[PDB]
Amino acid sequence: DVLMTQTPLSLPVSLGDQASISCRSSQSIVHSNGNTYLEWYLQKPGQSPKLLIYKVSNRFSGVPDRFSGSGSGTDFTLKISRVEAEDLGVYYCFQGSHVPWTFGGGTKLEIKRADAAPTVSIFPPSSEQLTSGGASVVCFLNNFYPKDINVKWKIDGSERQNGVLNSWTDQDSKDSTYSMSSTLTLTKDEYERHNSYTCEATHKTSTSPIVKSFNRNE
Amino acid sequence: VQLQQSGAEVMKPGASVKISCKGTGYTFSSYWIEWVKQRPGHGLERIGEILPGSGSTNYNEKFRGKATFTADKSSKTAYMQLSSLTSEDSAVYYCARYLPYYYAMDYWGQGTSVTVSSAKTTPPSVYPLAPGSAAQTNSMVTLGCLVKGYFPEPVTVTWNSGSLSSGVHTFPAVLQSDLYTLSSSVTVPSSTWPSETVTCNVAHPASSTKVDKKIVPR
Ligand SMILES: *[C@@H]1O[C@H](CO)[C@@H](O[C@@H]2O[C@H](CO)[C@@H](O[C@@H]3O[C@H](CO)[C@@H](O)[C@H](O)[C@@H]3O)[C@H](O)[C@H]2NC(C)=O)[C@H](O)[C@H]1NC(C)=O
Numbered sequence: 001d002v003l004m005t006q007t008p009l010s011l012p013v014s015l016g017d018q019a020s021i022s023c024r025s026s027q028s029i030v031h032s033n034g035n036t037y038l039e040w041y042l043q044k045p046g047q048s049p050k051l052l053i054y055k056v057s058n059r060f061s062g063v064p065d066r067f068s069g070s071g072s073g074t075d076f077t078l079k080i081s082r083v084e085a086e087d088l089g090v091y092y093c094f095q096g097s098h099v100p101w102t103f104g105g106g107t108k109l110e111i112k113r114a115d116a117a118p119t120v121s122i123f124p125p126s127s128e129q130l131t132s133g134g135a136s137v138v139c140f141l142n143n144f145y146p147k148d149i150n151v152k153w154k155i156d157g158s159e160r161q162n163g164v165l166n167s168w169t170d171q172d173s174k175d176s177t178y179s180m181s182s183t184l185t186l187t188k189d190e191y192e193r194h195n196s197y198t199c200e201a202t203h204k205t206s207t208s209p210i211v212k213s214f215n216r217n218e
Numbered sequence: 219v220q221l222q223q224s225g226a227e228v229m230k231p232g233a234s235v236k237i238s239c240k241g242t243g244y245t246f247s248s249y250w251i252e253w254v255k256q257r258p259g260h261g262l263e264r265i266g267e268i269l270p271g272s273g274s275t276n277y278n279e280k281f282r283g284k285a286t287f288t289a290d291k292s293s294k295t296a297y298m299q300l301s302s303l304t305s306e307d308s309a310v311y312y313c314a315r316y317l318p319y320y321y322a323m324d325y326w327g328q329g330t331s332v333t334v335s336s337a338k339t340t341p342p343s344v345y346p347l348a349p350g351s352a353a354q355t356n357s358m359v360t361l362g363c364l365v366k367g368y369f370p371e372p373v374t375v376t377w378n379s380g381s382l383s384s385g386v387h388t389f390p391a392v393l394q395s396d397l398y399t400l401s402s403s404v405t406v407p408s409s410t411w412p413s414e415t416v417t418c419n420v421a422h423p424a425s426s427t428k429v430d431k432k433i434v435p436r
Pocket residue numbers: 033035319
């Protein structure tokens with residue numbers, strides 16, 4: 001199967017800027033009839049893909065003219081003249097010249113803007129969690145940018161990694177930020193024995209890692 | 219034209235699921251039907267194609283033996299049979315029209331999500347969380363509502379009739395070991411939280427479960 005490699009894996013660009021996406025083929029995908037069958041698709045979040053460009057020189061109907069395509073036997077690129085909010089999504093290249101036909105890796109598109117510092121928070125378990133027989137330790141990092149984020153679970157001077165949940169949120173729209181919520185499930189026998197818990201995070205905005213902690217013993 | 223796909227499916231490991239793509243408004247027998255897989259992680263993977271008019275089918279090397287394509291001409295429907303399943307097969311499956319070397323893949327199905335998991339349907343267990351006692355109180359403070367031990371998706375979390383929507387961050391559900399969870403943190407004025415009532419609502423259409431647990435200061 002012809003392998004199609006797409007770069008860059010991500011592309012942050014502020015509104016109105018030029019966007020360039022390149023797709024490369026493991027083999028030449030030219031066809032005898034003078035056309036090369038390469039197509040570009042856009043999949044906005046929570047929706048099925050859409051057709052933007054086919055036969056790169058050509059272009060689908062009902063699509064803004066800012067999109068354009070070019071390439072040769074094994075190298076192709078797609079250009080967006082002016083970026084807009086509606087243009088956010090994942091872009092795939094599709095080759096329709098050699099059976100079987102394969103998609104590209106995908107090039108997620110973000111919008112870059114004035115970065116913001118993270119706002120960390122920590123919520124210890126609640127009464128219901130105590131009664132059930134567990135302990136839900138959650139540290140919230142809301143409205144931070146960019147993805148240069150790493151959170152370390154330090155507790156009473158000891159770093160614990162087992163049971164550490166990693167799940168962030170896609171880029172927002174009103175804030176265009178990212179959020180991180182990592183959780184550490186604890187049991188009653190283990191929850192009380194520890195005295196102090198800390199939520200350790202690092203970011204490019206502040207070289208010195210931030211610290212946030214609380215003590216169970218009170 | 220319109221391509222209609224079957225509904226969502228949940229299957230135990232080792233079973234087989236058959237999903238359908240029904241096309242209308244065009245010559246069904248004269249167009250190839252392309253089956254595409256999208257794992258939650260990333261990427262679009264083409265499983266293969268079938269031409270309903272003949273019985274011709276193609277498969278990608280990765281999916282050979284895993285999938286089997288069949289088509290019914292009397293009813294404008296095409297099927298994909300997935301062989302012995304695993305957790306890896308959990309993804310959203312798409313069907314799309316296609317005519318090679320000519321106008322290409324301008325219509326897609328809505329997608330059909332398949333979930334492979336040994337779990338059974340479970341009702342949500344929402345445990346609202348409040349700021350820890352060993353923490354400073356300032357004007358800006360986050361809130362917390364945790365839903366865990368529920369299955370299957372989706373579960374919608376919202377405040378009291380959208381009492382305060384903007385400023386929330388609902389993180390994607392993740393499996394601790396066998397069941398999904400969810401974290402949703404929102405920010406409200408410190409002077410208004412003890413005065414105004416804020417609560418998180420939980421809905422589980424699959425389990426027909428609705429919960430409303432208010433959060434009070436620790
Ligand atoms: C099978 O053979 C036919 C007959 O030669 C091929 O049809 C020809 O295809 C070319 C390429 O698409 C057409 O030229 C193009 O026409 C469009 C529209 O006028 C123009 O915008 C392009 O710049 C290009 O000049 C040509 O008109 C067309 N000929 C006829 C009589 O329809 C066909 O491409 C071949 N298919 C395969 C898969 O080999």
